[PDB]
Write an enzyme that holds these catalytic residues in place. Structure first.
Site, PDB file in Angstrom:
ATOM      1  N   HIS A 160     -20.287   6.830  23.242  1.00 20.11           N
ATOM      2  CA  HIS A 160     -21.460   5.950  23.177  1.00 20.11           C
ATOM      3  C   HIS A 160     -22.522   6.486  22.210  1.00 20.11           C
ATOM      4  CE1 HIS A 160     -20.810   2.725  26.055  1.00 20.11           C
ATOM      5  NE2 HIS A 160     -20.288   3.588  26.909  1.00 20.11           N
ATOM      6  N   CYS A 201     -16.868   1.722  23.420  1.00 17.65           N
ATOM      7  CA  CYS A 201     -16.375   2.150  24.732  1.00 17.65           C
ATOM      8  C   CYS A 201     -15.263   1.208  25.305  1.00 17.65           C
ATOM      9  CB  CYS A 201     -17.527   2.298  25.691  1.00 17.65           C
ATOM     10  SG  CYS A 201     -17.170   3.393  27.067  1.00 17.65           S
ATOM     11  N   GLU A 247     -24.360   4.903  20.338  1.00 17.88           N
ATOM     12  CA  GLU A 247     -25.541   3.996  20.354  1.00 17.88           C
ATOM     13  C   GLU A 247     -26.564   4.323  21.448  1.00 17.88           C
ATOM     14  OE1 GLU A 247     -22.891   3.466  21.731  1.00 17.88           O
ATOM     15  OE2 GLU A 247     -23.096   2.248  23.572  1.00 17.88           O
TER      16      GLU A 247
END
Lengths: 269, 269
Positions: free
Chosen positions: A207, A114, A209
């Site tokens: 994102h 990000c 993750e």
């Protein structure tokens, strides 16, 4: 025939492979959640990993000072809650520059997430970020833009990934840079995965993750601050925030980190 | 603090694990393609695999006779081009019964694919198959129906899988059987993944093992035989057969086989 042959898929002889040395630079204030997420995701490899946690200079944590004479196989630079500022207005910008410059020479492959990706793109390649009129916020369909790239090993041609940001980088700006290759974009959310210098840098603007309820928590956090924010797209069933989130991005989050570790952080010879 | 700790994800110590003994029963006439697909998919494990190829009794191939006194960790029973017949009308039905009965006692986990799954469900659990008015044919969205099932480890809650069949089993018929658990269905295509006796049998009614152009080849094959067959759904862009197929099922095909091998075929103690 008396003697029948068998097909044997040979076991992975990773036993005698030196441990991968990995550093995680957490720029977040909500430090624990990010760390936990990234730690689960780097479990996606049969290899052994030594994970060194780092943070800025404004007990498992170290600073750049402690490792500037060291070499790492991999480095993860997380996002941060500073996206509306100009890069240079960010307090720790100068120390982050030293780390990113250090990464060129002392880290095999650095993964930027990000804002960290925007910072990496801006610093390394001059790619600017731009404000969005409303938050890009939800889970979005992406398409693979390159065939036969190890980082996208096993990816579906169409796959889902979360985005959460009030700023953006533009595909056209990334296109101009020879040393950058666009790996995955979204018609709606734009740029997600980009690779620089053959994996020397990996940039993930979305994102991947994120865990299950991350977007939910962000929604409620902003809603409670009295912000005007929409429900994350393609996340809640019927856009109802009381519903269990729909997780469509889990597999490609695992694949991203697994392929990074296996094909970019780990090198032979 | 002078002594900083590091996080170490320990390497998988699979080095000293005995090789998994796996048998593949290919009931197909287009034998090579199926074999190749399944062989790629079982590469999805760091473990070592001894793969024994079998076929019916009407040089790498063996018959049930050669292995009836042996035990296997895993067995794969493929589909076959006999779905419109009653099970008992199929030439080799009686020999297939012996193998399936054998699998209860001599194989840890048997994976059944498409017709093989219908045969397994019918023989083991009395689940009947039924004709469809038109071919279920294309790539379809599925949803996970059970949480915390090892076989679905890492699955997205919504995922894609191919189906290709003029027959079906019904969810309701599977629901009635206590020893069966429905793992994945599709609003459009119905039943895909079912597990029996805690993984003793795994049934996959769709064709997650299919490679990129398999549906394309089937379409053209049937179209050339002069059959009236529709373009596979959600496969060609704009339903144009001259276009490159869209592969949305690759990741969950790998996950299926990887989880089967890792959590069902391989057992500890």
């Amino acid at each position: 025939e008396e003697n029948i042959f068998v097909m044997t898929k040979e076991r992975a002889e990773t036993q005698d492979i030196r441990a991968l040395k990995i550093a995680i630079l957490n720029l977040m204030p909500t430090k624990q959640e990010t760390e936990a997420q990234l730690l689960r995701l780097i479990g996606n490899t049969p290899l052994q990993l030594d994970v060194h946690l780092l943070h800025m200079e404004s007990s498992f944590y170290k600073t750049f000072r402690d490792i500037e004479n060291e070499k790492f196989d991999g480095l993860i630079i997380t996002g941060a809650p500073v996206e509306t500022l100009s890069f240079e207005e960010v307090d720790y910008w100068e120390e982050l520059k030293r780390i990113m410059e250090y990464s060129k020479t002392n880290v095999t492959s650095t993964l930027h997430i990000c804002w960290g990706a925007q910072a990496g793109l801006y610093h390394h390649y001059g790619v600017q970020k731009y404000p969005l009129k409303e938050k890009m916020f939800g889970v979005f369909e992406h398409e693979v833009r390159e065939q036969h790239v190890k980082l996208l090993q096993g990816f579906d041609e169409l796959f889902f990934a979360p985005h959460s940001r009030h700023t953006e980088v533009r595909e056209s700006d990334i296109r101009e840079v020879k040393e950058l290759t666009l790996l995955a974009n979204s018609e709606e959310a734009g740029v997600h995965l980009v690779i620089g210098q053959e994996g020397r840098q990996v940039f993930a603007l979305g994102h991947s993750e994120y865990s299950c309820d991350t977007l939910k928590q962000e929604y409620e956090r902003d809603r409670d601050k009295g912000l005007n924010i929409d429900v994350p797209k393609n996340y809640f069933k019927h856009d109802n925030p009381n519903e269990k989130p729909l997780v469509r991005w889990r597999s490609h989050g695992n694949l991203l980190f697994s392929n990074w570790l296996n094909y970019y952080v780990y090198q032979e010879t």
